[PDB]
């Protein structure tokens, strides 16, 4: 009794991470610099593994977890899926909170973010060439320039980082973000606990507005008065950048984050799809409105950077912060320059909160159908089970709306699916494609979708995905960089609490196959044949008919 | 298939906290003036709870949670009491490992606490009376008195609480408390692992080496240079103190740690009692011997703090701590005195090993067996939920074994079981001797031991016990006091991070009543009979024959 399920793919395209995350990471890596990395993981890794999830799902019937019986020693990738959808969840919320602080914010003719004579701000916080407030002058520029008006209130007026030294003293949970956190927490319990397609309406309404807000932002950025300056930047594409690894790890999981592989969302969604659906057909076209989304986004956010580094006088470099609320200065920004700033703010923010809101509907979704597909107890609980979901998610998001909780939020976005995702997405390939067999996989896709998928899947699917994959997990652990937000270092421990969350997830499928063969029973010949057979054909174990134990299986593409 | 089980009982009333708690609430509160308020409410409510919990899990058959079929309301106590057994194991198994690290320590013929020569010790270390260093002079004295060789040894070379500053500067475990943690867990999990009475030779050893050691040390102890004036100050009686509300309420909590009522032990182990076995006995029994165990341990704390304050020229109420480390300093100068110390160390420190292995043995035993009677499946999974318990357990521990583990584990044995027992052992009377009836559980004694118990219990569980449990339960609400390890004040969020894991216990009842009417479907009238009748007669409820809706339920005793 699976809850089977044009606009449709257009909003899968968009996501948080497309609007809020893409842009500090193609500011980090260079405009261009990023794009070459970025399109180069999406067709040769992206896209080739979003049609794998999208296919084991809708073949399956499963979730991140059970779509394992094809080979039981994996299915500690579908558990370390889920609890990297989990730790995303918690800061997710957060970044909505900020977006319902700023809508709430938003709703006066003065916008908080246009001058510095607030309360938050602090004597360092020059307006824009003196736009609201006309004193002394721009003549010293800064590393990271946060005495603006639309930084110091984010920095002050929010988040009152100002009153946290760092992740050692993160402080006390704010309470004005604690309650837009219980608002969050609240509307998205009552959009899960009575089903999968209970809400419609957000992504209803996080299939256009989206779009249309990119496009007046573009369309007005681009006559920004230094706007040029910023587009430059983003077609200049920095070779030595490229030599880099950091850009590469970076695009990598950027990409699992904008097409949501690797959380389990994808295939827990699929496990609602019609089995005829054309997963490939739905890749492409998520895939290619991703890169479009992802392109047009960078060439609005350096268009604002460009004019914000011409009225500040600053460097585009220098200009703005390249952590997670860069969209929460850019954007406010612009919003000030267009007319009717108040009614863009709204509309703004409105859909920041919508698209944040599906979001992590899809992430706790993944979390709530992994589990209730493993255990049917929770299937008839569910209302129960959504509230305990949701309730751990607000407590363990309570570390990121405190004073400190930007360096929380930055651990987290680095460690909670940074390696991890990509050793998951690594082992769920070479599960399908080595294990189970690419050719099985082709087969299974003939059946569902009426041809058996081309070379150039079968080929990424078992070599290009995963030797790319396995390329960037290697050089992430090789070439790892102590963790910074903006100035501040963090402190060494805190390297090491990242690299435990990120062990966390990736820890489980080791520790799933010692459990798997332990709680086995038979010689070790006989338990291993059992981990690697479809659990509908565990009699050819009996029979002595592995496959996988014959050299053509893997000689099989 | 339940499994059904002189040195027994003696056993029983020996316990980490008769050993390691007591002493310190004594030396707290003065020597005589806790004597007064332990006796009271040892008689008055100890006492006639113990019988209550040990009948209750005789009668049942069930943990701490499924013995509210009689008054299913009140389960939320049993998860309550569960709750709180969790919370004590965290900080329990803490001083298990700094037994072991004190054993291991003890393998050498110059014991590490006589000194002030080793690497930990500060300048400010002075060798009693010059015992092994004959520098300088005893001019100066200090609140606690932290300069004494087998002091520093504890506070620099065991805990390394020098390195921390405060609750808010805990700093990394220690690796050596760590490697003695994983030992305790690993020890805890094979004594558990396989059943209840899997582990029988620790008990075997916690029956007579606890009694032995104390009379060893009582005899020693009162030969020693100043143990005379320890004496008289444990006879005087403070009536001022009496006067004061915090040796009432240590008083009580120390009862239910003393004895075991509250956490959910004695209803478990009793569910493995044979239907016919005299509770009034083991009640009576446990209560007389350890009220002598406690009076006789305290004599010997109080000869040894005679004997401390003479040779280092301190009073009394200055020349220890009086946190959870006394008995790490007091045992350990006592045995030095001893000829063959090192002998008299290792067999001291292997019986608060045992002793310390048996409680927290027991306090887990409630949390698998409560949890595994209310989940029939967590029942055949005892191997797995055994980890999961012990893990859990071990890793909450590693916050008591950080630099600053003292200041967490002060703040845990302040707020994981004091107003919160009280109010679940109040809850737990109340629910027994009012909602279900202090006559039907006399009723269910008859048929369980052939007598009817005497009017003393049955006044004493309807009215005595909750009304006195009433009053400490406000008392310390009411008058409740900050926080403070020794000389350092705790900030006030700690008070309140306290009052978060005292209420969440407590929460737990009230949220119980909550989900169980919303859960229960009828109406109001219904729903609540239906909360407040044995769940083996809800027939009565369809047919309209609620005793507890007939006052004479109310006025039957
Ligand atoms: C750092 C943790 C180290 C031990 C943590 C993991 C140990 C043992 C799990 C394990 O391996 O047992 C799995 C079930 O796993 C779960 O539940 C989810 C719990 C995973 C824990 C999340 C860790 C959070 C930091 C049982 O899998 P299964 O036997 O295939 O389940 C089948 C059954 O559900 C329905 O047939
Ligand atoms: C600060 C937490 C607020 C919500 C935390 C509690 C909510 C809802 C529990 C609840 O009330 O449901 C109970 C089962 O409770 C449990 O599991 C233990 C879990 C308790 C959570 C421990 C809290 C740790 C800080 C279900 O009781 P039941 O319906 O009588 O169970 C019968 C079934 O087990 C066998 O028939
Ligand atoms: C299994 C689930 C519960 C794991 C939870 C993971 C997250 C929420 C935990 C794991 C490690 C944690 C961090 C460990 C240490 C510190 C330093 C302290 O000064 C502030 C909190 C902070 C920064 C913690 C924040 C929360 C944290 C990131
Ligand atoms: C078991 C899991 C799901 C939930 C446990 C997480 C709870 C206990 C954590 C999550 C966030 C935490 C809070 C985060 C930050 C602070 C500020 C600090 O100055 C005092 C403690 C306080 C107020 C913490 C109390 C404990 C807390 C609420
Ligand atoms: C611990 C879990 C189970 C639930 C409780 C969450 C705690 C940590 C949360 C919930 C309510 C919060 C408080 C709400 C409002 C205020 C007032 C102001 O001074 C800011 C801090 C303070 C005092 C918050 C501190 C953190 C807080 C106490
Ligand atoms: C904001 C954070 C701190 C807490 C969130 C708690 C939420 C999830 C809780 C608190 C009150 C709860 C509601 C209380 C009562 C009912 C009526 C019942 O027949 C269906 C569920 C429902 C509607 C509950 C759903 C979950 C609920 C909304
Ligand atoms: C726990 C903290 C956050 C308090 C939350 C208060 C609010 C958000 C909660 C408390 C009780 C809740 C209500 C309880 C019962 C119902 C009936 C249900 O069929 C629909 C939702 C509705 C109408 C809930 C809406 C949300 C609600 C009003
Ligand atoms: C068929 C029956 C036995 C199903 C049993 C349900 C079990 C397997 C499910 C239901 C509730 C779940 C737990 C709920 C909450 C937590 C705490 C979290 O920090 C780690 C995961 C953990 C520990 C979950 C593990 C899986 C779990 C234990
Ligand atoms: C946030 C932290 C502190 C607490 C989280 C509590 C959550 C994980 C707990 C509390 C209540 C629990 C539920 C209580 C009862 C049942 C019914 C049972 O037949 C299946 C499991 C299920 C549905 C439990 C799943 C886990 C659960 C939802
Ligand atoms: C620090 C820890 C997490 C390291 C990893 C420990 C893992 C591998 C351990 C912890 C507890 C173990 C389980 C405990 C009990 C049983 C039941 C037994 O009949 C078969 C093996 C099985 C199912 C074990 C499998 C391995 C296991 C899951
Ligand atoms: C449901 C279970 C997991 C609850 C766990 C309760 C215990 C282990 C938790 C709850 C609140 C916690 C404390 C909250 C805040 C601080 C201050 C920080 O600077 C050091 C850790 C310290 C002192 C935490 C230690 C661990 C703690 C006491
Ligand atoms: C889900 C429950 C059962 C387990 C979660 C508790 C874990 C994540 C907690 C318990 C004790 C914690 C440690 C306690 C103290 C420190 C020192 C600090 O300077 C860095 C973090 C570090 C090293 C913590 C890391 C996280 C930690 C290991
Ligand atoms: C996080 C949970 C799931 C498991 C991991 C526990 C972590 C917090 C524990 C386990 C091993 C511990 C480390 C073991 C030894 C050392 C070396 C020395 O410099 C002291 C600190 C340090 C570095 C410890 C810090 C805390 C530590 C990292
Ligand atoms: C010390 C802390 C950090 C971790 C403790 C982990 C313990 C509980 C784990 C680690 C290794 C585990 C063992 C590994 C394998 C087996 C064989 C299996 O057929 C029965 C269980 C048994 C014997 C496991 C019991 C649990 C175990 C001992
Ligand atoms: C996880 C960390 C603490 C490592 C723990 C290492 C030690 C304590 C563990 C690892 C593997 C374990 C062994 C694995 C399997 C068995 C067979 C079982 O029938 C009895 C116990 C025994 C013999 C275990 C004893 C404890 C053991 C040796
Ligand atoms: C009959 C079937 C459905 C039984 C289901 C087992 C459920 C009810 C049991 C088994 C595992 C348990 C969970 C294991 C671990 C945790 C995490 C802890 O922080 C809070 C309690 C919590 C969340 C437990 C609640 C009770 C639990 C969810
Ligand atoms: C210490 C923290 C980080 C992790 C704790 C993990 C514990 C609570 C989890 C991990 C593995 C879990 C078990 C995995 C599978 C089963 C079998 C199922 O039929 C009943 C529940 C049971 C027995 C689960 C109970 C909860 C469990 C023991
Ligand atoms: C902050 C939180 C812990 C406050 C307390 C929330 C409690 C009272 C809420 C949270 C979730 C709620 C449950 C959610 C869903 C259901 C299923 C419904 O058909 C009957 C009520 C029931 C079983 C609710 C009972 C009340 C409940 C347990
Ligand atoms: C963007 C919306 N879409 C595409 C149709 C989704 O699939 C998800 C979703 C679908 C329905 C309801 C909630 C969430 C939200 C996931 C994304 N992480
Ligand atoms: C002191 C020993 N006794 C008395 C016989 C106990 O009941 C417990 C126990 C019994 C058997 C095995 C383990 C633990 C340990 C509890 C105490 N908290």
């Given at each position: 009794?699976?809850?089977?399920?044009?606009?449709?793919?257009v909003?899968?395209?968009?996501?948080?991470?497309?609007?809020?995350?893409?842009?500090?990471?193609?500011?980090?890596?260079?405009?261009?610099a990023?794009?070459?990395?970025?399109?180069?993981?999406?067709?040769?890794?992206?896209?080739?593994?979003?049609?794998?999830?999208?296919?084991?799902?809708?073949?399956?019937?499963?979730?991140?977890?059970?779509?394992?019986?094809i080979?039981?020693?994996?299915?500690?990738?579908?558990?370390?899926?889920?609890?990297?959808?989990?730790?995303?969840?918690?800061?997710?919320?957060?970044?909505?909170?900020?977006?319902?602080?700023?809508?709430?914010?938003?709703?006066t003719?003065?916008?908080?973010?246009?001058?510095?004579?607030?309360?938050?701000?602090?004597?360092?916080?020059?307006?824009?060439?003196?736009?609201?407030?006309?004193?002394?002058?721009?003549?010293?520029?800064?590393?990271?320039?946060?005495?603006?008006?639309?930084?110091?209130?984010?920095?002050?007026?929010?988040?009152?980082?100002?009153?946290?030294?760092?992740?050692?003293?993160?402080?006390?949970?704010?309470?004005?973000?604690?309650?837009?956190?219980?608002?969050?927490?609240?509307?998205?319990?009552?959009?899960?606990?009575?089903?999968?397609?209970?809400?419609?309406?957000?992504?209803?309404?996080?299939?256009?507005?989206?779009?249309?807000?990119?496009?007046?932002?573009?369309?007005?950025?681009?006559?920004?008065?230094?706007?040029?300056?910023?587009?430059?930047?983003?077609?200049?594409?920095?070779?030595?950048?490229?030599?880099?690894?950091?850009?590469?790890?970076?695009?990598?999981?950027?990409?699992?984050?904008?097409?949501?592989?690797?959380?389990?969302?994808?295939?827990?969604?699929?496990?609602?799809?019609?089995?005829?659906?054309?997963?490939?057909?739905?890749?492409?076209?998520?895939?290619?409105?991703?890169?479009?989304?992802?392109?047009?986004?960078?060439?609005?956010?350096?268009?604002?950077?460009?004019?914000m580094?011409?009225?500040?006088?600053?460097?585009?470099?220098?200009?703005?912060?390249?952590?997670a609320?860069?969209?929460?200065?850019?954007?406010?920004?612009?919003?000030?320059?267009?007319?009717?700033?108040?009614?863009?703010?709204?509309?703004?923010?409105?859909?920041?909160?919508?698209?944040?809101?599906?979001?992590?509907?899809?992430?706790?979704?993944?979390?709530?159908?992994?589990?209730?597909?493993?255990?049917?107890?929770?299937?008839?609980?569910?209302?129960?089970?959504?509230?305990?979901?949701?309730?751990?998610?607000?407590?363990?998001?309570?570390?990121?709306?405190?004073?400190?909780?930007?360096?929380?939020?930055?651990?987290?976005?680095?460690?909670?699916?940074?390696?991890?995702i990509?050793?998951?997405?690594?082992?769920?390939?070479?599960?399908?494609?080595?294990?189970?067999?690419?050719?099985?996989?082709?087969?299974?896709?003939?059946?569902?979708?009426?041809?058996?998928?081309?070379?150039?899947?079968?080929?990424?699917?078992?070599?290009?995905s995963?030797?790319?994959?396995?390329?960037?997990?290697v050089?992430?652990?090789?070439?790892?960089k102590?963790?910074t937000?903006?100035?501040?270092?963090?402190p060494?421990?805190?390297?090491?609490?990242?690299?435990?969350?990120?062990?966390?997830?990736?820890?489980?499928?080791?520790?799933?196959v010692?459990?798997?063969?332990?709680?086995?029973?038979?010689?070790?010949?006989?338990?291993?044949?059992?981990?690697?057979?479809?659990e509908?054909?565990?009699?050819?174990?009996?029979?002595?008919?592995?496959?996988?134990?014959?050299?053509?299986?893997?000689?099989?593409?």
């Open positions: 009794p699976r809850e089977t399920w044009l606009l449709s793919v909003g899968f395209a968009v996501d948080l991470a497309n609007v809020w995350r893409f842009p500090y990471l193609c500011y980090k890596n260079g405009g261009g990023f794009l070459i990395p970025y399109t180069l993981f999406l067709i040769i890794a992206g896209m080739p593994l979003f049609y794998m999830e999208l296919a084991l799902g809708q073949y399956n019937r499963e979730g991140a977890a059970t779509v394992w019986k080979c039981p020693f994996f299915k500690g990738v579908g558990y370390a899926v889920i609890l990297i959808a989990l730790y995303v969840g918690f800061y997710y919320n957060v970044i909505i909170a900020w977006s319902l602080y700023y809508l709430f914010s938003s709703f003719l003065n916008l908080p973010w246009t001058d510095c004579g607030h309360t938050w701000n602090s004597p360092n916080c020059t307006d824009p060439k003196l736009l609201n407030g006309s004193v002394l002058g721009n003549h010293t520029k800064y590393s990271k320039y946060k005495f603006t008006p639309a930084a110091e209130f984010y920095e002050r007026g929010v988040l009152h980082l100002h009153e946290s030294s760092g992740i050692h003293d993160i402080g006390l949970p704010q309470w004005q973000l604690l309650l837009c956190l219980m608002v969050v927490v609240i509307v998205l319990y009552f959009s899960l606990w009575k089903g999968v397609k209970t809400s419609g309406k957000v992504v209803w309404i996080t299939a256009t507005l989206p779009y249309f807000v990119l496009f007046v932002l573009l369309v007005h950025g681009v006559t920004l008065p230094g706007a040029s300056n910023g587009i430059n930047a983003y077609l200049h594409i920095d070779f030595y950048r490229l030599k880099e690894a950091t850009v590469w790890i970076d695009a990598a999981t950027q990409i699992f984050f904008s097409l949501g592989a690797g959380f389990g969302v994808l295939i827990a969604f699929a496990s609602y799809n019609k089995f005829d659906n054309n997963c490939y057909r739905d890749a492409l076209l998520t895939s290619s409105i991703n890169c479009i989304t992802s392109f047009v986004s960078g060439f609005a956010i350096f268009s604002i950077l460009g004019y580094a011409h009225e500040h006088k600053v460097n585009i470099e220098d200009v703005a912060t390249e952590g609320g860069l969209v929460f200065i850019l954007y406010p920004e612009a919003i000030s320059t267009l007319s009717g700033s108040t009614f863009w703010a709204v509309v703004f923010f409105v859909m920041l909160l919508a698209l944040g809101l599906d979001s992590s509907m899809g992430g706790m979704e993944a979390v709530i159908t992994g589990l209730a597909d493993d255990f049917q107890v929770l299937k008839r609980h569910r209302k129960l089970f959504t509230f305990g979901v949701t309730f751990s998610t607000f407590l363990l998001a309570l570390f990121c709306i405190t004073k400190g909780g930007i360096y929380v939020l930055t651990l987290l976005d680095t460690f909670a699916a940074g390696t991890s990509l050793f998951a997405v690594l082992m769920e390939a070479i599960g399908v494609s080595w294990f189970y067999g690419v050719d099985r996989f082709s087969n299974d896709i003939q059946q569902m979708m009426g041809f058996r998928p081309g070379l150039y899947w079968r080929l990424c699917w078992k070599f290009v995963p030797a790319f994959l396995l390329f960037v997990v050089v992430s652990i090789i070439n790892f102590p963790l937000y903006d100035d501040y270092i963090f060494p421990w805190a390297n090491w609490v990242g690299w435990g969350i990120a062990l966390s997830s990736m820890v489980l499928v080791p520790i799933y010692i459990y798997k063969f332990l709680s086995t029973q038979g010689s070790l010949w006989e338990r291993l044949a059992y981990g690697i057979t479809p509908n054909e565990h009699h050819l174990v009996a029979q002595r008919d592995i496959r996988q134990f014959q050299l053509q299986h893997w000689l099989a593409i």
